Amino acid sequence: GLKAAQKTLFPLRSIDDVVRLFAAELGREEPDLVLLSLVLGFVEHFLAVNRVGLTYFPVADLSIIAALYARFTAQIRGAVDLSLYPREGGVSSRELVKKVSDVIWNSLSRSYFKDRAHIQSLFSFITGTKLDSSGVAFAVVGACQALGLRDVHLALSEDHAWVVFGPNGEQTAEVTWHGKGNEDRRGQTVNAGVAERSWLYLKGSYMRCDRKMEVAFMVCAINPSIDLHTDSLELLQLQQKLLWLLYDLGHLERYPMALGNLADLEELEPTPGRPDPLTLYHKGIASAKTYYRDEHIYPYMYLAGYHCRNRNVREALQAWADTATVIQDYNYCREDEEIYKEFFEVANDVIPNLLKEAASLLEAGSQGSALQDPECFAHLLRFYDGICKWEEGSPTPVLHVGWATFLVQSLGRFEGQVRQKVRIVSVPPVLTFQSEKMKGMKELLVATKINSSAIKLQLTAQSQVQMK
Numbered sequence: 001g002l003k004a005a006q007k008t009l010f011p012l013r014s015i016d017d018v019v020r021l022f023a024a025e026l027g028r029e030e031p032d033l034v035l036l037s038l039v040l041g042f043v044e045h046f047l048a049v050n051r052v053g054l055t056y057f058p059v060a061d062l063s064i065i066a067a068l069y070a071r072f073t074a075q076i077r078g079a080v081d082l083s084l085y086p087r088e089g090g091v092s093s094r095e096l097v098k099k100v101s102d103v104i105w106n107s108l109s110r111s112y113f114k115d116r117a118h119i120q121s122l123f124s125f126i127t128g129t130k131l132d133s134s135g136v137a138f139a140v141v142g143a144c145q146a147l148g149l150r151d152v153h154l155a156l157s158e159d160h161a162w163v164v165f166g167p168n169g170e171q172t173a174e175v176t177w178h179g180k181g182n183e184d185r186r187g188q189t190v191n192a193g194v195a196e197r198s199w200l201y202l203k204g205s206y207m208r209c210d211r212k213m214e215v216a217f218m219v220c221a222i223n224p225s226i227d228l229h230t231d232s233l234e235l236l237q238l239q240q241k242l243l244w245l246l247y248d249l250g251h252l253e254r255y256p257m258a259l260g261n262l263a264d265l266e267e268l269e270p271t272p273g274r275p276d277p278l279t280l281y282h283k284g285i286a287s288a289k290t291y292y293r294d295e296h297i298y299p300y301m302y303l304a305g306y307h308c309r310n311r312n313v314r315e316a317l318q319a320w321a322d323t324a325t326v327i328q329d330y331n332y333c334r335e336d337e338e339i340y341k342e343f344f345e346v347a348n349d350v351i352p353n354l355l356k357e358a359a360s361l362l363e364a365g366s367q368g369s370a371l372q373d374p375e376c377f378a379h380l381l382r383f384y385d386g387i388c389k390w391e392e393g394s395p396t397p398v399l400h401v402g403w404a405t406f407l408v409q410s411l412g413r414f415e416g417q418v419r420q421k422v423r424i425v426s427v428p429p430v431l432t433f434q435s436e437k438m439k440g441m442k443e444l445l446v447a448t449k450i451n452s453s454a455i456k457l458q459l460t461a462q463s464q465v466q467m468k
């Protein structure tokens with residue numbers, strides 16, 4: 001509007017005042033995405049970007065917020081003439097969606113660092129003419145809502161955002177860029193990406209937001225970071241309280257990564273009476289299994305990271321094995337590089353450092369060590385099996401000799417008598433391999449001294465050894 005009822009809580013003088021505003025908007029027919037994003041971006045700017053003069057909370061006065069809102073709606077309504085795009089049946093056209101995307105995109109500063117923090121909100125769009133990639137998609141949806149286009153909604157994968165719209169909400173349209181050097185397909189569907197079984201489009205099991213989930217997205221998008229080593233306590237608490245509000249209203253039910261975000265916040269500072277982080281990570285995994293065919297990677301990564309921080313080697317390895325069992329049914333495609341990076345870092349840095357400490361503690365007499373548990377060895381094997389199966393039939397390889405050295409080292413952290421106890425069973429502690437690489441590695445996995453050269457040959461499918 002702003003409508004009179006949206007104005008009565010101002011000025012916002014505290015975190016709890018902001019929560020009351022989110023609660024009022026979430027109780028409305030449609031929560032005002034533009035209003036809420038401006039408020040979050042305002043508060044984040046003066047709690048994380050520029051804290052000069054801060055005495056408690058940056059008071060958000062109505063005159064300030066209303067002027068920003070007016071700037072946004074004047075820009076959108078001046079630039080998008082709806083009479084040029086007749087709406088058949090309350091649904092938007094592809095040309096109208098592309099026009100709004102063009103308006104947002106064409107407003108952005110010509111050159112700036114797209115990976116900077118604090119450029120996610122409409123506050124950054126208005127005051128700095130800067131948005132990150134998914135911020136552009138959110139802004140398109142907010143502009144569409146301001147124009148009355150009730151059918152345009154945010155669509156989210158684990159590393160990209162676009163919009164759905166049109167009859168039955170069945171159309172998709174790219175509205176922003178993805179990655180760096182990748183060239184944008186703004187205005188096109190996501191059907192080629194779904195058909196190629198890339199992780200980026202989740203085989204079609206991506207999130208189709210309603211307006212309440214779009215509120216949850218902007219709340220996840222809060223960035224409490226002040227710099228490398230310092231977070232805003234105020235912004236952490238604000239994001240935590242807003243996630244619990246959404247949780248209680250049922251709006252995180254279909255949002256796995258938001259549940260993992262909330263679990264991370266509870267780990268940092270638990271709220272009395274609320275579920276433990278572990279309960280929340282498992283709800284996030286349950287959400288992915290229930291609504292998204294268990295095709296999401298990050299619910300298991302959230303869990304693994306928690307167990308990693310708590311040096312629970314057994315449970316971290318189980319969660320990473322489960323991450324690999326999801327990825328194995330994808331094809332590794334160009335533009336999936338973010339998930340390749342995460343698996344690379346887990347295999348080649350995080351697991352080695354975890355097992356190195358476990359080895360030292362074993363030498364110091366620890367009991368019940370993961371390194372003496374055959375089920376833990378099986379989890380390590382299943383992790384590599386899913387990565388090898390991922391690679392099968394992909395248009396580009398995954399493994400190379402730079403993975404082989406760490407595999408050999410991690411295998412060797414388990415004594416031969418532990419590795420011997422895993423029974424590897426063929427279809428048609430027990431483990432079945434899906435990948436041909438790990439099936440051929442089976443015989444090598446139980447020798448007292450692991451044949452490092454033969455392991456490397458099998459993992460990289462290297463044909464030959466050195467001539468001389």
Ligand SMILES: Cc1c(CN2CCC(Nc3ncnc4sc(CC(F)(F)F)cc34)CC2)ccc2c1cc(C#N)n2C[C@H]1CNC(=O)CO1
Pocket residue numbers: 134156157158159160161217220257258261298301302304305308342345346350
């Ligand atoms: C937990 C976590 C994170 C945190 N992320 C925060 C942002 C979350 N994203 C989103 N969240 C909510 N909504 C959306 S909507 C959307 C699409 C968009 F809209 F943006 F396009 C994205 C997105 C995804 C999770 C990173 C790496 C993690 C883990 C855990 C592990 C392990 N194990 N790892 C790998 C390790 C490897 N090595 C290391 O040293 C340390 O990390």
